[PDB]
Design a protein around this ligand. Structure first.
Ligand code: B12
Ligand SMILES: Nc1ncnc2c1ncn2[C@@H]1O[C@H](CSCC[C@H](N)C(=O)O)[C@@H](O)[C@H]1O
Ligand SMILES: C[C@H]1O[C@@H](n2cnc3c(N)ncnc32)[C@H](O)[C@@H]1O
Ligand code: SF4
Ligand SMILES: [K+]
Length: 358
């Protein structure tokens, strides 16, 4: 339950599924980059743009919110007309960001900024972001945190910032940064820079360091949903749903959400769809593909009537990431196996979907 500013300066409700998944205050307003925004100026070694399969349809650009000269004007408009809690995110702080910009953003009315920091070691940040000026942002963080509530994002990348994550959190706390969010790196089978996922032992090590720092330091240390999912410890906190369908019913989910979805729907068959299109450690349900779904459909019995539920998050408009149109995927399933396919965004929507088809 949050908002973002549109290109024409209007409000648009959004969900945590369009951000990083963390639960946020309900007066949050995100100021995204406009069309006047340029690129990030980096070449991060883990950059997801650089590890997509070779024949995937290109999606979005390398937008950096700060590379929009109309940002202040959009912040000032939002402050006057909505007076919500204004956050800027999607920035590495390496372009169009200095003391003067911090002042102008503060006077415009910005409340909070969320920066991709990754590490407070300058030489490491230079190599990890392939940007020889990446150390300047680290020097600015104390001044940043004096002006805004500051959230530092860290993409945990083995060989760069995993072993010394405790020192990085201490540095951020001493700079006055208010919050740090820890994201284990996502690696496909097409990564070109010898980036590797955190092992199970590395995930646990970072988790324990983060819990220790969070009970010592004033900085809020956040282990976000993707991290908990990679640890096998993700939960919605919801009571299990006792919906019991009369007809063959399947909930398709990804590898990361499968344990929680299986727990939430004890009388429904939950099907884990492994992501062979992306491979690596990709397992989130918004990255499911038409071909992976069709592989698991192939294993199902034919039915005179049956329901398959898919996560709505895997569709962008009516397209999947691997090039399927929604209606073509659904018609192939109906003709070949007999199932109706429905989609929904959140787990709490599933009982009402099932009830309507029933
Ligand atoms: C972390 C993340 C990544 C990581 C990888 C994570 C991983 N290891 O799998 C990285 C940064 C590598 C990444 C990359 C990409 N990502 Co990404 N990513 C995310 C993000 C921000 C969070 C995922 C998360 O928190 N998962 C935690 C688990 C528990 O969530 P989950 O599996 O989705 O399950 C929940 C819901 O889906 C739902 N649910 C689950 N199963 C089911 C089933 C049913 C039937 C129902 C009703 C509900 C339901 O309930 C669950 C509990 O909340 C999401 C947005 C988001 N907030 O979800 C985008 C998102 C998945 N990514 C997206 C995109 C576009 C990409 C890229 C293609 C970007 C690009 N242009 O290259 C790449 C592809 C891979 C690559 N090249 O690296 C889009 C996908 C949209 C689409 N399908 O067209 C999303 C949805 C962002 C968005 N809002 O647009 N990503
Ligand atoms: N392989 C990967 N694993 C995890 N997070 C990744 C990733 N590749 C990129 N990210 C992070 O996912 C977010 C994409 S949002 C856009 C950020 C913006 N381009 C910027 O200037 O920083 C950023 O925090 C980015 O650092
Ligand atoms: C994978 C997709 O999710 C978006 N996204 C939003 N927040 C994050 C985050 N903290 N880490 C990774 N991707 C994120 C990216 O902008 C990309 O388009
Ligand atoms: S900041 Fe880094 S990860 Fe984000 S788009 Fe630019 S190069 Fe890719
Ligand atoms: K704390």
């Amino acid at each position: 339950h949050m908002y973002e500013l549109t290109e024409d300066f209007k409000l648009r409700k959004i969900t945590k599924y369009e951000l990083d998944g963390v639960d946020e205050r309900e007066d949050l307003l995100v100021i995204p980059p406009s069309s006047k925004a340029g690129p990030c100026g980096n070449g991060c070694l883990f950059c997801y743009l650089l590890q997509n399969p070779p024949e995937m349809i290109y999606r979005v650009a390398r937008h950096d919110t700060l590379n929009d000269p109309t940002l202040e004007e959009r912040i000032r408009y939002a402050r006057k007309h909505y007076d919500l809690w204004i956050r800027v995110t999607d920035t590495s702080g390496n372009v169009k960001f200095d003391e003067n910009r911090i002042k102008s953003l503060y006077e415009a009315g910005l409340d909070e900024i969320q920066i991709s920091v990754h590490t407070t070691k300058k030489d490491v940040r230079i190599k990890l972001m392939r940007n020889r000026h990446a150390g300047k942002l680290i020097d600015l963080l104390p001044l940043v945190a004096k002006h805004f509530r500051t959230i530092a994002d860290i993409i945990l990348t083995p060989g760069f910032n995993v072993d010394d994550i405790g020192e990085i959190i201490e540095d951020l706390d001493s700079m006055g940064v208010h919050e740090v969010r820890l994201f284990p790196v996502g690696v496909t089978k097409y990564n070109r820079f010898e980036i590797r996922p955190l092992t199970k032992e590395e995930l646990s090590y970072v988790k324990e360091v983060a819990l220790e720092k969070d009970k010592e330091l004033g900085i809020k240390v956040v282990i976000p949903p993707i991290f908990l999912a990679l640890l096998g410890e993700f939960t919605t906190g919801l009571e299990p749903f006792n919906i019991e369908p009369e007809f063959p019913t399947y909930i398709f989910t990804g590898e990361l959400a499968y344990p929680e979805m299986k727990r939430l729907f004890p009388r429904i068959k939950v099907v884990m769809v492994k992501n062979e299109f992306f491979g690596g450690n990709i397992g989130t349900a918004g990255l499911l593909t038409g071909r992976d779904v069709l592989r698991e459909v192939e294993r199902l019995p034919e039915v005179d009537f049956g329901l398959i539920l898919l996560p709505e998050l895997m569709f962008y408009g009516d397209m999947t990431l691997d090039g399927w149109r929604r209606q073509d995927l659904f018609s192939k399933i109906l003709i070949e196996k007999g199932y109706i396919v429905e989609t929904a965004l959140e787990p709490t929507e599933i009982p009402k979907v099932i009830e309507k088809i029933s």
